[PDB]
Write a protein that binds this ligand. Structure first.
Ligand SMILES: COc1c(-c2nc3cc(NS(C)(=O)=O)ccc3o2)cc(-c2ccc[nH]c2=O)cc1C(C)(C)C
Length: 557
């Protein structure tokens, strides 16, 4: 029952890979300790292969089957539609990996006869054959981090024609089923502001609250054949078109359960018997399985009044405390149950008695004050990885602009406002690229966003207070200041000096640029302008921004 078997063939790159931080004329204005920033490359794929390869044993008890029966009762209320080839084509990212069969992502998006004809033949083969393993490509991800070096994470994905078929069969399922099955526990239905609100209300709902985050070691590799067949039985509870039922059974048998792994040079690398990290069902499958195992583990541990918050492989549990020592024993029982379910831990879970000390989705709740002096809870994170990635993005154009995603998701934070906004608006002004749409990812889905639209996006997700927050916590200020000294980033007083210049330069341009100056940088002036709702914000189609998670799902919105 191994997660993977290997031939010895290498996981090969597609292009030239850079590991050392690229340096340009802008680099030093952001970060001086260049040797601390690195990117992962295929050179470390061999080490990751060793980490992800292990035997999985599963012991399933009555708590497991009880929770599964409850989940299936809710899943039976879902009605899902089959997307047309055209609808599925339009969900494809413009820079999605080209097919092996003579067409790419732009051919798909343009509904080219060749792409559409190949997608129809892949679909027909899914209906007619429910046995043949489907080919997948295995790649090493190129991701940026700060030292203290991680080996490259791996991505496993089927061909472009298969990905369009996955959308046709399961896009509606993976978008609507998780919230129906898990209700308020489904994390991807919330904006960061709604996630904060859910965490605070849950913490308050408990007489003596205790909370913990549970880190499953290499989650995708812990997902067994049973787990993948169980996820399929959940999808099959939906009211579905006969062709969708057949395609879902086919995709589960031929792709989701496992299959051969091919490198970028066409060599057989081995065989996968665990979750594929680059399929449409990665996020939904991970969320459902994590929620199932954790809800059953909570019953086995006799945890009282358990509220879960699940996002793929990320899990937060808030419950009633039995006192510090009993909570510690309780958590070891929870961990034993998770382990029997084939979800052992990385770091052992730690009981927390302060909401602000729980780290989940690399984030924590913190408090600041709005213009009226009222306490405001918001989500923040250690800014090390956002800052290492901003330094890379200062000297290189990348497919996903992490700085833009981070300003969107962490707009109320002291570090996104003072550093990211200041640095990148300065760069965009110098290149007159404020109107240029840039790609970013929100809950794994790809978006093409113009930086000029940031005031309206921030207002809609976080409210006007995101432009007024002040009197940040001593703990939060200390973590930001320590991160700056560690990376060789100029102190906050420098960013404030720079922001006044960036603000003045934006206001000069007028129009949408002046709105960016006015709203994004009001924190930088001593005589603060009165901020009122932006008329353009109501018009924004913020559609399925926070409906579901799509990590590795090849989704463009
Ligand atoms: C929900 O938490 C997130 C997530 C997020 N996506 C996750 C996906 C997984 N697992 S998987 C691969 O199986 O799907 C686990 C934890 C995750 O956290 C992403 C961003 C995020 C941050 C910056 C840019 N784009 C983003 O999507 C921001 C938040 C916050 C701010 C709400 C905490």
């Amino acid at each position: 029952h191994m997660s993977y078997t290997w031939t010895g063939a290498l996981i090969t790159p597609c292009a030239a890979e850079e590991s050392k931080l690229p340096i340009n004329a802008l680099s030093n204005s952001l970060l001086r300790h260049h040797n601390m920033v690195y990117a992962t490359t295929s050179r470390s794929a061999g080490l990751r292969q060793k980490k992800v390869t292990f035997d999985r044993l599963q012991v399933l008890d009555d708590h497991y089957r009880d929770v599964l029966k409850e989940m299936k009762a809710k899943a039976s209320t879902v009605k899902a539609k089959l997307l047309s080839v055209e609808e599925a084509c339009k969900l494809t990212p413009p820079h999605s990996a080209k097919s092996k069969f003579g067409y790419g992502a732009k051919d798909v998006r343009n509904l080219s006869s060749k792409a559409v004809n190949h997608i129809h033949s892949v679909w027909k083969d899914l209906l007619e054959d429910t046995v043949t393993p489907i080919d997948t490509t295995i790649m090493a991800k190129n991701e940026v981090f700060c030292v203290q070096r991680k080996p490259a994470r791996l991505i496993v994905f089927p061909d472009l024609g298969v990905r369009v078929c996955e959308k046709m069969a399961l896009y509606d399922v993976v978008s609507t089923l998780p919230q129906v099955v898990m209700g308020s526990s489904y994390g991807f239905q919330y904006s960061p502001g709604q996630r904060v609100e859910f965490l605070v209300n849950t913490w308050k709902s408990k007489k003596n609250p205790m909370g913990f985050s549970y880190d499953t070691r290499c989650f995708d590799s812990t997902v067994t054949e049973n787990d993948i067949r169980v996820e399929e039985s959940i999808y099959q509870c939906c009211d579905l078109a006969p062709e969708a039922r057949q395609a879902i059974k086919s995709l589960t048998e031929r792709l989701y359960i496992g299959g051969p792994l091919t490198n970028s040079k066409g060599q057989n690398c081995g065989y996968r018997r665990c979750r594929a990290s680059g399929v449409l069902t990665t996020s939904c499958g991970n969320t459902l399985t994590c929620y199932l195992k954790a809800s059953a583990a909570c019953r086995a541990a006799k945890l009282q009044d358990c509220t879960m918050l699940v996002n793929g492989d990320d899990l937060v549990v808030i419950c009633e405390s039995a006192g510090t020592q009993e909570d510690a024993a309780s958590l070891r029982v929870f961990t034993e149950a998770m382990t029997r379910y084939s979800a052992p831990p990385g770091d052992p879970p730690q009981p927390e008695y302060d909401l602000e000390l729980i780290t989940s989705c690399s984030s924590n709740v913190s408090v600041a004050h709005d213009a009226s002096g009222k306490r405001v809870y918001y989500l923040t994170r250690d800014p090390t990885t956002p800052l290492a990635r901003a330094a890379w993005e200062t000297a290189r154009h990348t497919p996903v602009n992490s700085w833009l995603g981070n300003i969107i998701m962490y707009a109320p934070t002291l570090w996104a406002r003072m550093i990211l906004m200041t640095h990148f608006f300065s760069i965009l002004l110098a290149q007159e690229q404020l109107e240029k749409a840039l790609d970013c990812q929100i809950y794994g889905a790809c978006y093409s966003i113009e930086p000029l639209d940031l005031p309206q996006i921030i207002e809609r997700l976080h409210g006007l207070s995101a432009f007024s927050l002040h009197s940040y916590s001593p703990g939060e200020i200390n973590r930001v200041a320590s991160c700056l000294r560690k990376l060789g980033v100029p102190p906050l007083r420098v960013w404030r000096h720079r922001a006044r210049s960036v603000r003045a330069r934006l206001l000069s341009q007028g129009g949408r640029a002046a709105t960016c100056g006015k709203y994004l940088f009001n924190w930088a002036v001593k005589t603060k302008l009165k901020l009122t709702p932006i008329p353009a914000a109501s018009r924004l189609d913020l559609s399925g921004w926070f409906v579901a998670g799509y990590s590795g799902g090849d989704i463009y919105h």
